[PDB]
């Protein structure tokens, strides 16, 4: 996250870190046994880490659970990142409390202008790298589809939305992929992609979760 602030330990209780020997993507806990992330974050041997603040120090509220199965969206296209969403089922259910809790899926899609909270352990610099050990947060608005397609001609589909600042300086970044975009207590986006990070007129692009609620609910019900 570039231009954000330190969230504070366990104030984003649904945030998870996907680990394969190291942190490589974020995710969101939607119920005690399922996590949603970005399809481009897929790999085998994923351990899901809940209740994390500093990912290099066991501070006491962590739950490390391995995934039993991963389901990448049937129409995921890795060249265009269209339908960049995946579900991960945990081998055992997590113990939910105030520091580890699930986030609700949306009943309606959010409109441009809505302010949301984006979080993650990704790079904090636009040029150069500095990965934080503790969770960073950014409050950003969803941009209109017109501004979004204007910033990324020929690359935005109905399954994506842009959120951020056209002026630059504040954005999610590498290492934040797969994480949450929460607006009014509902999970509306998944950090997906961007051109660089926090550059002027290049806002972040997010998977539009409201378009996958039926697929998520049906998949969970049968697996
Ligand atoms: N500017 C952004 N909003 C952004 C967000 C997540 C990203 N994730 C990545 C990324 C880069 C290389 C490999 C995997 C990634 O998720 N770039 C990213 C850029
Ligand atoms: Ca920790």
* Ligand 1 neighbour 204 (Cβ under 6 A): yes
Domain 1-12+103-210 identical in fold to domain 13-102+211-223: yes
| Fold that domain 13-102+211-223 belongs to in CATH | Thrombin, subunit H (2.40.10)
Q: Are 102 and 35 in contact (CB under 8 A)?
A: no
Looking at residue 12, the DSSP 8-state letter turns out to be: S
- Of 17, 84, 119, 176, the active-site residue reads 84
CA distances from 110 to 36, 116, 141, 164, 177 (A): 18, 10, 10, 15, 20
- Method by which the coordinates were obtained: X-ray
Mention every residue, 6+ apart, whose C-beta is less than 8 A from residue 29: 13, 14, 15, 16, 35, 50, 94, 100, 101, 102, 103
Mutate to test the pocket of ligand 1, among 175, 193, 196, 206 (most ligand atoms within 8 A of CB): 193
Resolution to 1 decimal, in Å? 1.4
133 annotated to a ligand binding site? no
134 annotated to a ligand binding site? no
Rg (CA), the chain: 16
Ligand 1, residue 204: give the atom nearest the CA: 3
How far apart are the CA of 89 and the centre of ligand 1, in A?
Answer: 23
Q: Domain limits of the chain? A: 1-12+103-210, 13-102+211-223
Residue 203 host element (H or E): none
The CATH number of the structural domain formed by 1-12+103-210 is 2.40.10.10
Round to whole Å and give the CA distance between 188 and 182.
6
CB count in 10 Å sphere of residue 187: 24
Round to whole Å and give the CA distance between 91 and 64.
10
Round to whole Å and give the CA distance between 211 and 11.
27
CA 114: distance to chain centroid?
A: 17
Q: Are 181 and 163 in contact (CB under 8 A)?
A: yes
């Amino acid at each position: 996250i570039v231009g954000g602030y330190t969230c504070g330990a366990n104030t984003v209780p649904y945030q998870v870190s996907l680990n394969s020997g190291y942190h490589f993507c974020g995710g969101s806990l939607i119920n005690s046994q399922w996590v949603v992330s970005a399809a481009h974050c897929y790999k085998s041997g994923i351990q899901v880490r809940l209740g994390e603040d500093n990912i290099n120090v066991v501070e006491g509220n962590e739950q490390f659970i391995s995934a039993s199965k991963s389901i990448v969206h049937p129409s995921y296209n890795s060249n265009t990142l269209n339908n960049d969403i995946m579900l991960i089922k945990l081998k055992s259910a997590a113990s939910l409390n105030s520091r580890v809790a699930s986030i609700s899926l949306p009943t309606s899609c959010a409109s441009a202008g809505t302010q949301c909270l984006i979080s993650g352990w990704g790079n904090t610099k636009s040029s150069g790298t500095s990965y934080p050990d503790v969770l960073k947060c950014l409050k950003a608005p969803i941009l209109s589809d017109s501004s979004c397609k204007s910033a990324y001609p020929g690359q935005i589909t109905s399954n994506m939305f842009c959120a951020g600042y056209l002026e630059g300086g504040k954005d999610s970044c590498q290492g934040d992929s797969g994480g949450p975009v929460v607006c009014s207590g509902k999970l509306q986006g998944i950090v997906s992609w961007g051109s660089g990070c926090a550059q002027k007129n290049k806002p972040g692009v997010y998977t539009k979760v409201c378009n996958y609620v039926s697929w998520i609910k049906q998949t969970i019900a049968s697996n």
